[PDB]
Design a protein around this ligand. Structure first.
Ligand SMILES: O=C(NCc1ccc(S(=O)(=O)c2cccc(C(F)(F)F)c2)cc1)c1cnc2n[nH]cc2c1
Ligand SMILES: O=C(NCc1ccc(S(=O)(=O)c2cccc(C(F)(F)F)c2)cc1)c1cnc2n[nH]cc2c1
Lengths: 465, 466
């Protein structure tokens, strides 16, 4: 079973002995620190952490003893605030005396703004605020995944709109292929849920169950897939029988969309001779609701996509849409799922546009770090001897690492943007309502968002228009 | 509860229908495909076998669950309910799969077979690649273990050159990465991979994982000591940094303590606060209880060098037998900002050039490694259809680097004592001695395992082996 007493950075076990004596409050905040482009971030994923790890009776006698035993060996010393944890157990039935206030999930907020704050609700637990920094800071991952996919969606939207005149199918243009490529089963679920804030096509099944458990959708599921081959289902037929594999597979899935990886031996031969001649009669007969989706999976991503389109355009009837761009027949599409990151995605759609190919023709299949958006948790306010003091770091050699001072609040500006007020200036009430809401207090999740609301919050402007 | 029927890439749910008719065997393998990082540490499969693959992993409820989910996910009935029911009924939900692997901790050159997977029942030909997704995640502990071993080689080289020995090497790179990984589970797995190489960690999650899945003779595989963070310094107020420092070193007067010193001005903190105002509290400390000063901002190399020069002028420095400068034993430095394998190299070389021993410094690790770094990859190499075995492979025209191995594979020692992978069942010709892979999983049971102590021994540096 998960033990919150064992879910912090080791050194934090020793911090209760280091704060100023007579400190009754430690108040901390999380931001995606501005850096002297990723100018706005999607706040997403805190609700998962709150429910899975922070809520309810998270302290027990057994958990305290377990931690005591582990830390004794780990530190070769008895340092461990057994009394402090006992107090939470006895006084609060093992519920964390913490209040967390956060911007609503799905909100798109410029860099350098307070996203959530954390403080102890009982003076005895001044040490607890930063104990849980480690676990809360891992919110950097769903925030950065949600943000990065939103930025990729902006690129796709721009090019789809320009080449087609509309945004039809946009939410299925970037399919999550990343399950095998992440570091763990837990990460797979979290990352997939963040992808699904932006898109609806996924092969990372783990994301569905996480969304259902922690967030919820009106629809039975938040994400979808369709049949497709992998190299093993093609190569198993033998090198001389690729055509036989293709035929079997498209015939098995004759009435649903089917994607078929076509580069096992020679992608260009597969497109021109196998799909484009030998099996063409099985493709042109397919429904608009059940296209063949050809998947190249190797070579230079841009060069290969363009050459594949060029080949298919000469073997199948191409039309020109009202924007002047070339469009494959509705029973035939292409998906590129090799080497697609935000930079290469841009390169491909731009390259397609230059060659007069509509983005309607293509879909894509998809490391990020905590430093990308400078996700950071810092103490900004403490009360010592009954006096509040505004605290901060400001390293001489790096002004980019300066932190905010005092009690914080987030507000709409008169022009409708965002501003973070420091030093308790929100109390002056010159800027309307604080946009941070209490989401956790004393062991209870106090405000929750559905996955539907989060998706709405995270919409692109071009979608709103 | 984890459900293996829901732990694969969605498209794999449809593959049972796509293999050639009458296929009785699918056989696949994992390698770190050949294209720095010429040898990889094989580590982490044992966790996956025990946590996810062994025992009764199929139940009626899990089958119904997957059926319901996939019906909505695919907007159609495509899920192989019958195939999973067969495993439930015939094998009491244990997977009819055999896995053979190189021993955990082994250091093996790129492009060798590391593990193989095949079905042991003809009805379950589709099962081999169902579990590709789960098994391929072994890329992460392999890559973490490998990258940290490569960092250890750099540290060993420079520590040996500047001090004449390797004392303290296993405490020279401390894991600071708990907050910077993607999940609690990843934290435990990644920390365990770090601990294959080192013994100092702040990622507590790693200890319990090692204890549960691997085991050590010692109570714990990794250690830490007290240290400050910016909040425990800055909480005292901007004008009271000295008061914070004094309190902390006094609270931890008889154990090692690390104090971050860059909250406002690292150079002033070192020269005036530590080096003058509080010097009397430092020079009185035991060799077993040093102050470890931690800069945490600025150019990592430039900052380390300036911090050492400052301390060198305020504290008595000696010259060791190799001619390098050494701080007194009650005083050390740790650099935990911006340290990846490249910057680690730049710092130790920069120190060497300025005649500072590597004894003076430790590093904190806390750059993202991906599955592409070592080209970790799982591919089908052999199938049996209509009773005939066939050697299979991909070989994409535009990328020869993605060509996969053919046929049944085995791992062997060459006459010179190196590794070679034999393809096309050639291992059976008995010209290269015994297959070095061991069966580690068969029919729902883990059949061979390794303690964490043995894994560490397997992963040792040559320089450590002397
Ligand atoms: O092909 C794969 N999965 C199936 C798949 C995914 C995505 C598409 S798609 O063309 O985006 C598409 C088409 C129609 C409906 C949907 C829908 F509405 F359902 F989203 C998605 C079609 C098929 C695949 C391929 N390679 C992989 N490597 N690692 C994981 C992988 C997964
Ligand atoms: O200082 C931190 N943790 C405590 C710590 C770690 C490492 C050292 S060390 O100097 O390598 C050292 C010294 C003596 C014994 C050990 C031993 F034998 F115990 F390993 C380690 C001393 C203290 C720390 C600092 N910043 C962090 N950011 N994110 C996580 C962080 C952890």
């Amino acid at each position: 079973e998960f033990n919150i007493l064992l879910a912090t950075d080791s050194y934090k076990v020793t911090h209760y002995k280091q704060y100023p004596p007579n400190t009754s409050k430690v108040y901390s905040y999380f931001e995606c620190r501005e850096k002297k482009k990723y100018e706005e971030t999607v706040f997403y994923g805190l609700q998962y952490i709150l429910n899975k790890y922070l809520k309810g009776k998270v302290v027990t006698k057994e958990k305290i003893q377990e931690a005591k035993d582990v830390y004794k060996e780990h530190f070769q010393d008895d340092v461990f605030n057994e009394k402090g944890w006992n107090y939470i157990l006895e006084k609060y039935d093992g519920h964390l005396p913490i209040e967390i206030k956060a911007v609503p999930e799905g909100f798109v907020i410029p860099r350098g703004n307070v996203l959530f704050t954390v403080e102890n609700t009982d003076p005895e637990c001044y040490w607890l605020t930063n104990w849980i920094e480690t676990i809360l800071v891992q919110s950097w991952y769903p925030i950065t995944v949600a943000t990065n996919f939103r930025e990729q969606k902006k690129i796709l939207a721009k090019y789809l709109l320009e080449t087609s005149g509309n945004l039809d199918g946009l939410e299925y243009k970037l399919h999550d292929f990343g399950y095998r490529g992440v570091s763990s089963q837990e990460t797979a679920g979290i990352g997939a849920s963040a992808h699904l804030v932006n898109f609806k096509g996924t092969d990372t099944v783990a994301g569905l169950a996480l969304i259902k458990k922690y967030y919820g959708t009106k629809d039975p599921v938040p994400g979808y897939s369709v049949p497709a081959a992998e190299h093993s289902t093609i190569t198993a037929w033998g090198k001389d029988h690729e055509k036989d594999a293709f035929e079997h597979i498209v015939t098995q899935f004759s009435s649903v969309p089917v994607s078929v990886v076509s580069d096992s031996y020679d992608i260009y031969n597969a497109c021109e001779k196998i799909w484009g001649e030998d099996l063409r009669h099985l493709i042109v007969s397919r429904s608009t609701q059940a296209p063949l989706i050809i998947r190249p999976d190797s070579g230079n991503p841009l060069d290969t996509v363009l050459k594949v389109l060029e080949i298919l355009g000469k073997k199948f009837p191409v039309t020109e849409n009202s924007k002047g761009y070339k469009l494959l027949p509705p029973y035939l599409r292409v998906i590129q799922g090799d080497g697609v990151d935000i930079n290469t995605l841009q390169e491909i759609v731009e390259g397609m546009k230059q060659k007069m190919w509509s983005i309607e023709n293509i879909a894509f299949g998809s490391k990020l770090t905590r430093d990308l958006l400078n996700c950071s948790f810092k103490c900004s306010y403490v009360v010592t001897n009954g006096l509040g003091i505004n605290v901060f770091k400001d390293p001489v050699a790096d002004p980019n690492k300066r932190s905010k001072k005092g009690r914080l609040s987030l507000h709409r500006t008169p022009a409708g943007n965002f501003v973070t007020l420091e030093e308790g200036k929100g109390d002056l009430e010159e800027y309307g309502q604080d946009l941070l809401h209490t989401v956790f207090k004393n062991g209870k999740v106090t405000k929750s968002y559905s996955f539907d609301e989060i998706r709405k919050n995270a919409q692109l402007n071009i979608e709103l228009e």
